[PDB]
Amino acid sequence: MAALTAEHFAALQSLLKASSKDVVRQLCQESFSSSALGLKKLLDVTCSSLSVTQEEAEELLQALHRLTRLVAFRDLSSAEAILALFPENFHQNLKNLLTKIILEHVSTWRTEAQANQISLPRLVDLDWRVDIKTSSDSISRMAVPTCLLQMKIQEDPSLCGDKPSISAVTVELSKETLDTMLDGLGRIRDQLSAVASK
Amino acid sequence: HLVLETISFILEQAVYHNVKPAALQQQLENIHLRQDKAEAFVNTWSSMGQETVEKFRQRILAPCKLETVGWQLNLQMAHSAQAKLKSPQAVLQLGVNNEDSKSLEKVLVEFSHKELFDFYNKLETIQAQLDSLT
Amino acid sequence: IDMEWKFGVTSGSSELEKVGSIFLQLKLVVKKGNQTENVYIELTLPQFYSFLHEMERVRTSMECFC
Amino acid sequence: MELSESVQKGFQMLADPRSFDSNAFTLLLRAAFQSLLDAQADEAVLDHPDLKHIDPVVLKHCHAAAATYILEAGKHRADKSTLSTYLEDCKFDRERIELFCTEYQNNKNSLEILLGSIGRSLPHITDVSWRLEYQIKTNQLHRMYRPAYLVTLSVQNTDSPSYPEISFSCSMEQLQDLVGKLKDASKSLERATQL
Amino acid sequence: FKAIVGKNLPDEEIFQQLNQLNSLHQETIMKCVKSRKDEIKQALSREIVAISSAQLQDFDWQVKLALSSDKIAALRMPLLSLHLDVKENGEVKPYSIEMSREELQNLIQSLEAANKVVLQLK
Amino acid sequence: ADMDFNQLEAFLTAQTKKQGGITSDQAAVISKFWKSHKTKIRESLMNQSRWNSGLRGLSWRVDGKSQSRHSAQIHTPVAIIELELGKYGQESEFLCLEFDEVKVNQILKTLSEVEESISTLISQPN
Amino acid sequence: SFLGAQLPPEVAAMARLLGDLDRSTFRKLLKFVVSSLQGEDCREAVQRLGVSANLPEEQLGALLAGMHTLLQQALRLPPTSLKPDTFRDQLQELCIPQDLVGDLASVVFGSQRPLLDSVAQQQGAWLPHVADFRWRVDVAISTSALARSLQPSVLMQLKLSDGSAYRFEVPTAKFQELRYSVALVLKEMADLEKRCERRLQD
Amino acid sequence: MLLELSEEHKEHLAFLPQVDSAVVAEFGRIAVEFLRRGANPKIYEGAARKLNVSSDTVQHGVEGLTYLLTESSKLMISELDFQDSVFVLGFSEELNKLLLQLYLDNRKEIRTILSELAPSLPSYHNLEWRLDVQLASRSLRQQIKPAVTIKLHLNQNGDHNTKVLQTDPATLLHLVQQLEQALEEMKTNHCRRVVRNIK
Amino acid sequence: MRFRFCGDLDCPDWVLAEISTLAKMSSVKLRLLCSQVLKELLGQGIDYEKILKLTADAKFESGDVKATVAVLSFILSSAAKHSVDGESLSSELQQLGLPKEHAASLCRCYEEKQSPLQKHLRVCSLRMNRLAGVGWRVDYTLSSSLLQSVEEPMVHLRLEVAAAPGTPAQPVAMSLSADKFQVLLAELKQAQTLMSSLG
Amino acid sequence: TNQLVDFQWKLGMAVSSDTCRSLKYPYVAVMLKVADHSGQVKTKCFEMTIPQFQNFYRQFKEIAAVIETV
Amino acid sequence: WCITTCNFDVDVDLLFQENSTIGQKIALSEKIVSVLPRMKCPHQLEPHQIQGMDFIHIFPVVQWLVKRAIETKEEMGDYIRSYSVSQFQKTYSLPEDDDFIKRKEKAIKTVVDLSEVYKPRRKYKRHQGAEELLDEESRIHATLLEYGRRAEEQRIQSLMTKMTAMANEESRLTASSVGQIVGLCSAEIKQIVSEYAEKQ
Amino acid sequence: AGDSAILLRAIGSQIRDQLALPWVPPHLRTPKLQHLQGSALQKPFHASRLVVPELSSRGEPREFQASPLLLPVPTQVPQPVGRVASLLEHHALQLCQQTGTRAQRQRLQKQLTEHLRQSWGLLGSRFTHSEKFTFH
C-alpha cells in the first residue's frame, strides 16, 4: 500500500463538510469494502448525502479507501501509530474522530480482507452416497459397493465471465481409490496433531 | 514396461523421502534386490538425485504458469487527436502457459511512465514480502 | 483416476503484509468417457478436517451393509 | 404482382355499394393503413360505430384483404395506373378508385420506409483513428528506429455477433499500400457517376 | 388442449373428463375445442418438425449488381444473397450464402427435384 | 434404384444389346459383385443421407442405494443409464440419466405405445 | 494553414453556407459540435434544432460536418503552434464572418479547452492497460511429490481495462526476471526523455 | 556501450585460447549454424573426444561464443567498442581478429532473427474491395443502394485472419482523407527532427 | 501525366523505378520472364528455378528478382484490369522510358493471353461466399406421441458453402416443414427472374 | 446426474434423397428433455432404426425386471 | 527531391513543380536560393538564373545535391526498393523465403535458451533502513545494482554500501515456516483437533 | 440495351447524390443521415402465423370468428416489421397452395406400408503406482 498525500488529506477535510459522524463512519466502512464499480455507485451515494461536488466526493472516497486499506495492510495496532499518519495541520477533532472509527473497524477489516484473497476455486459443499451395484447390461448379478462424491465449487466471478460462478461435479470412487486418497490425506493430519509438520 | 514403471516407482519414493544413500542401499536389499543392482542405484542416485529433487521442488500445482517476459519501448509522435507528442510508451508481453491445454497465451499490456512506476512499486512490495521469509 | 495435492501457508498478500493462513490445494483427475479433466479445489484448514472426517465415514459404510 | 383468390374476393366485396357504402369503405380503408403503420396494436381499430352493421366475419375478411393488397402494391412500387387498372377489374366505381388512390398516396412514403427497413447487412465501418510511434528498443534488439502506425476501425452493426473495433498495425509501406487500395476504390465510384 | 386434440378424442370422452367442472366451464371448453381444433392440430405438426437437430426459422434474400472490383474494372456480375435463421440448441444462428446466376440455377434445379417427391406425398 | 434381379439384369441386358455394349459375362461379374455389395451400399447411402444424431449405444446398471452423508439408511433401488449419440463422421457424446423404479415403468409404457402404433399401421391393410 | 495544404471540401462548403446563417443558430449548432467531441449523444437534439431553424437535413449535414472538421484540426495543435492572432487571420481567408470567428476562437482558446484536451489525450491508447493487480505470497510445506518442499511462489491476478482477467502462478526465478525487466525499462524511459529534452526541445 | 561480460561468461570463453585458431574457426562455423537452424547436442560429445575435453567444456565454449555474437549484434556495437570489450579477455591478436571478423560477417543476419522475438501485434496483410448496388429485396422490389464491400486480411502470430466489412461512398471518402493525413505526419518538421536526432 | 494501364492515374514511383530494372535484361529473356509470370497469373504455377536461371544473365541479386517479378505482375494485371490493348500498352510503356525492343516483346505476350487473363481475373474477383453443393432428403411422418396420426411430408436440406478456395466446404444443415419448403422454392424462383433481367 | 423432464417420439419413413431415389426405410426419432443442476433444461434428439428401437425397448424391459428383484 | 532526401536540419517546406506557370516557379526559385546557403552549398545560384536555367552554371549545384543525396540513402536505406519487395512478398515467395519460414521456430528457440543460461541473477540485497525513497531514479538504480547492472562512480559506491551479498537463486526456507505456522494457526489447529476428537 | 442503359444512368445519379453529402459524425446524424451512412438499425424478417376469418365458416367455428376473441389480422403481431413479414409470408403460402393420380398415390402409400412391415417383420504417477502396488 502506497502512502497518502496532502491532496488526500484535503479530501478528508470534506468530512468537516459532511453532515454527521456516522456519515463519516459510513463512508469509511463502505470505502474499505467497495470495489471500483462500487465506488461509482458509492460516489452517487456520497454526492447525494453530502451535496458536495462530485470531485470532492470522489477524492474523499479515494482518500478513505487509501487511508483505511493502508492501516489494514500495515495492521497499525494503536492510535499513536494511526495518528502519526495524519499531518500536523489536520483538523484535530476530525483526526481524532477518524482514529476512533479506524480502531473499531480495523479488527473486522483484517478478517474481511483475509477471506477475500485470490485463490484456486473454493470448495463450497460436499455430499456423498454409497450404493451397492447389483446388475448391469453385461453381468446378471453383482455386489460391488461404490461411492459417488458430489462437490459444489465456486470461482471468482471476475474470472468466470459468461459462465456461472458456482458449479457441481460428481466423482465416483471405488474403495481401492478411496483407500489410496485416505492415506494421502491422513499424512497431513498426523503432522498437525502436534502443531508442526513431520 | 512393468520394469520401467517399477524403476520409476523406486526413484519416485527416493525423491519424496529424499533418502540418504546408505538408507537406500538397505531398502533395496530389503526387497531382496541383488547387491550389484542395489549398488548401481546408489551410485546413480548420488550425483543426479540432488538435481532431480530440486527440479521437483520447482514444480507448480496450478492450471497456469507465467512463462516468458518481453517488452518494447516506443516514442509516441502524433495521433489523430493531438500533434507534436514526445511520450515514451512501453508494451509488456506476458506469456502464460496453460498446461491443461498445452497452449501458451500472450498477454499484451501498455504502460505510460507513471503507470509503469506504479507497477514497479507493487513488485517492490512483493519482493519485501519474499525477503521477509529468509 | 489420479489426485495431486499441495499443503502450504499464506505468509503475505496484497491486502495484508502478514497473513499466516494454512491451505490445502487438490488436483483431481477425472475420466469423462473418452477424455479426462482436471478439477482444482482449494480447502481451508477447517474444511480439510471436515473433508477427511466424511471420507472416513464413507470407508466404514463401504465395509458394512444391511 | 399476383394476388390470391382470397384477396380478390375481399376486394370484390369492398366494390359492392350494398355491402359497403362509401362511408364504410373509407373507414375500413383507413383502418387498414393504421393497422399496418401504427406501432400501437390497436385491437379496437375496427370498432368504428359506422362499421358496426357489417357482419364481423365479412368485415375482418375485407380488412385483411385490403391490408394485404396495400403491402403487395407497396413492395412492387405500383403506380396509379397499375392501381386503377386492378381496381376497375374488381368492378370499383370512379369514386372509390379516387378514394383508394388518395389514401394510398398519403401513406406511400411511410409504407416504403417501413418495407425498406427489413433485412440484414454486413458490419458497417463508421470511423477510423491512427497513432504514429517511433520504435526504439526491444529486450532483444536495440536501435530499431522505425515508424509504425496503429490503426483502429469503428464498425457499427448488430445483425450478427460482433466486436465494435478492429485494431491493426502498419509500417510505412503497409499504410501506403492500404491508402492506395482505398483510393483505387474511390476512383471507381467516380467512374460510376459517369454512367 | 394439446392432449385431447392429439388423441382425437370423441366428444363424449371429453365430457366425461369435464364432469367435475362448473357447467359453464364444461360448456366453454367444449366450444373452444370445436372452434380451435384445426388450429391446434397445425401447432402440433409444427412441433413434430422440432424433433430434429436444427430447423429453418426464417429466410430473406437480396439481389445486387457488382459493378467493379480491384481485379477487374468492367465487372457487371449479378449476385444473390440468401440469409437463413437456423434454430439449434435453443438458439437462432444467422447464416449467409452468396450465389451467382449459375449457382442459383443449380440450387433451384435441386429443390425442384425435392418438390416433385413432396407433391407425390402431399 | 436399388435394383432387384429382374431390373438389374434387364438394364444390363439392354447395355449388352447396344453398340460398344458390355458382354453378358461382364454383366454376370457385375451381378455377382452387386449381390454382396447391395447390402453394404444401401446402408452407406442411409448414413450419407442422415444429418441428425443417431444412437451409437445403450448401457445401463442398477444400484442399491444404502447410505448417504445425511440419510443414515436408504434402500430404494435406482437405474443409471448411459446413452451414446453422434453425427456421422463426428465424435460421440455421452448422455447419462438416472431413474427410479417408477420412471423406469413410465418410459417402458411409452415405448410400448410406439410398438402398438407400428402394429396398427401394418395391420390396417387387413 | 492548420487545415493543411489543400482545403477540405466539407470546410469550403460550410464556409459559404455561414453567410446565410443567423448567429443564434450558429451558436446553437456549435454547442452540439463541442459536446459531441466530448462524447455526448446529440442526435435527437440536432433534429429538433433542424425543424426549429427550418434547415433541411442536407444543409444540417453540411454545416455540422464542416464545423467538426475545423475544430478537430485546430484543437489538435498545441498552444505553441496555433495562437489567437494567427487562427483569426487564417479563418478570415475562408471569408467566415468576423462575429462567427470570435465564437470559434472562444471555443479553441477559452475555458472550454481543458476538458477537450483531456478527452483528446484519452485517444492515444490502443492496447489495454492494467486495471487491477493483486497477489498472494505462499510457501509450500508438503506436496504429493515431496514430504518437505518449503518453496515460495507468488500467485498473481491481473485485471485489464479490456475487461479481461488472468490468474497465474509465478516461480521466484521468474519473478526475479519480471522485476529486473520492469526496472530496466524505467531506466530506459528516463534516458529517452533526456535525449528528447536536449535535442528535440530547443 | 561496451559489453559487460559476466564472470561465468568469461570463464566459458577462456576455452577459446586453449586450442588452435583453426578449431576456433570450426566453433565459429557451428555457432552460427545453430543460430541459423537450431542446436544439435550430438556434436558436443564428438568434439569432446577429438579435443580430449569434457562435452560440457565444448558446450560451454561454443554456447558462450554464440552469446558473444548475439549480444554484439543486439547492441550493434562498433568495431572500436567491440575491441575495448573483448580485450578484457587476455588472448592474443590472432584470436581477437578472428572474433571481430566473425561478428561483422554475421551481425546483419542475426539481427534479422532477433527482430522476430518482439511482442506480436496484429498487422495489415492485404485488402480487397467490390462496388455493389443492391437492386431488390424480398420486401421491396426496386432500389439503388450502393456499397463498397471490403475484405481485410490480417496477420498475427503468423496466422492469417480475414474480416468482411462494408462502407457507404461518403464514409470511404472520409477513410482516405484521415489516412492521408496519417502519411503526411512523417513529412512534418516535428517528425523530421525525431528521425534526425533520435539515432 | 496519366496512363491507361495505371487506371487513368500517374504512374507509381516504385513502378517507374523498377521499369529501369527491366531494361537491364536482354529483350530475349525479358520476354521469357513475362511468360513465367503470366503463367502464374493464369493459375498454372510459377517456376522460380527458371526465373532465377535466366535472370543470371543480368547478374540480378534476389532483391532485383523480387522487384522484377512484382513490376511485371503489376503491369500485366493492371492492363488486363482496365482492358488496355497491347498497342496502347507498348506506346505508354515507352513514355515511361522502357526501350522499344523491350516494350515490343512485353506486349506481344500480353496480346496472346489478354483474353484468358480477363476470364481468370473475373473468377478471382472478390466473393463473400460460394455455394459448393446441395443435398436433400424427403421424409413422410406416420404417427407421434404428440399427434396420433400425422401423415405429412418433411424436407431436410444440407448446403455446402465455401468461404475461400482450397478450403473444405461448410455444411449448413436444417429441417423444414413442407409449407416452409414450398415458400422458399417459390421465393428463389422470383429472385432468379430478376437476376435474368440483369445478365 | 441428469433427470428426464419429458420424452417424445415420432415414427416416419425416409422416402427419397438426391443420391438415392428409393430409400424407403423407417426410423424412430426420440426427443429427450433433461434438467441439469440448478434446473437448467435442455433437449437432445436422436434417430433409431427399427431394429435399434426393438433392442432399446427390449433392454428397458430387462431393467424393469431386475429393478423389482434387486 | 534531392533536398528533401538530405534532411539537412532545415525547416525545408517547398512544393514540387506540378508543371506550374510563372508565379509558382518564381516563388520556388527564391526558396531554393534561400535554402542552399543554409545547407552550406558551396555553389551560388540566382532566381533569375533559374528561370533562364543556365545548365552550365546549375550543373555544379546539382553535383552537390546528388552526391549528398546518394550518401544519405546509403545510410538510411532505399525506401522504394523496400516497397517493391513488399509487393512481392504479398503474393510470392522465393525458395529461400520458404526455407527461412521452415526453420524459423527452431532458430528462435536457441536464442531464448541462451538468454536463460546467461540471464541476470540477483547478486546483492539492499538494507531496509536508510530509505532510498527520496527519488525514483536512485530507487531504480539501487534495484539494478542488485543484479550487478551498474559522481556516477560515487553514486554507485554510496548506493552499493547499502547492500549485502547473496548466494541463492530460489528462496527456499530453512524450515522457519513453523514460526508463522504455529504463531498464527496453532490456536485454530488446537480448536479443530479438539472438535474432531469430540465428534468421534 | 435501353432498359439496362436506364438502370445504369439511375445508378450513377444515385452515387452522385451520396458523394455530394459529407460524412457526419455518428453522434450528430439525424435519421436521414443514419440511413445513408449506416448507423440506423434494420430489423430481420420474422414471420408469425396468423388466424384469418373464413367466409364459408359455419356452426361453432363461425361463432368464434364473429366475436372479439378473434383479433383483426394485422394487429395480431405487436411490431410493424413483424406484422409486415407475417402478412407477406401468409399470402405467399396461399399462392403456393392454390397453384397445387389417386391410384398412384394409394399405390405409393401401400409401397411405404410394405417397407414398414418388412422392417418390423425381422421380429417375426506415484499415486497410480501406489494404488497398483499397495492398495489394488
Residue numbers in the entry:
A (entry chain I): 1 to 198
B (entry chain J): 69 to 202
C (entry chain G): 135 to 200
D (entry chain C): 1 to 195
E (entry chain H): 62 to 183
F (entry chain A): 65 to 190
G (entry chain E): 23 to 224
H (entry chain B), I (entry chain D): 1 to 199
Question: What sentences appear in the manuscript?
Answer:
The Commander complex, a 16-protein assembly, plays multiple roles in cell homeostasis, cell cycle and immune response. The recently discovered multiprotein Commander complex is a master regulator of cellular homeostasis within endosomal transport and the trans-Golgi network. The complex regulates cell signaling by modulating trafficking of transmembrane channel proteins and receptors to the cell surface and diverting them from lysosomal degradation. We report the structure of the endogenous human Commander complex determined by cryogenic-electron microscopy (cryo-EM) and comprehensively map the molecular context and interactions of the Commander and individual complex interactions in human cells using affinity purification with mass spectrometry (AP–MS) and proximity labeling biotin identification (BioID).
The COMMD-ring forms the highly interconnected core of the complex. NTDs of several COMMDs (2, 3, 4, 5, 7 and 10) bind a segment of the CCDCs via this interface, which we call the peptide-binding site. CCDC93 proceeds to circle around the NTD of COMMD2 in a headlock, binding the peptide-binding site via α9 and forming a long helix-loop-helix motif (HLH) (α10 and α11) that reaches all the way around to the NN–CH domain. The final helices (α12 and α13) predominantly bind the COMMD domain of COMMD7, with α12 binding in a tight hydrophobic pocket, before reaching the I-coil region. CCDC22 occupies the lower half of the COMMD-ring. Finally, α14 of CCDC22 binds COMMD domains of COMMD1, COMMD6 and COMMD8 in a similar topology to α8, before reaching the peptide-binding sites on COMMD7 and COMMD10, and meeting CCDC93 at the I-coil region. Supporting our assignment, one XL–MS crosslink was identified between Lys318 of CCDC93 and Lys114 of COMMD7. The flexibility of the NTDs correlates with the occupancy of this binding site as empty sites on COMMD1 and COMMD9 are the most flexible, followed closely by COMMD7 and COMMD10, each binding a short helix between long flexible regions of CCDC22.
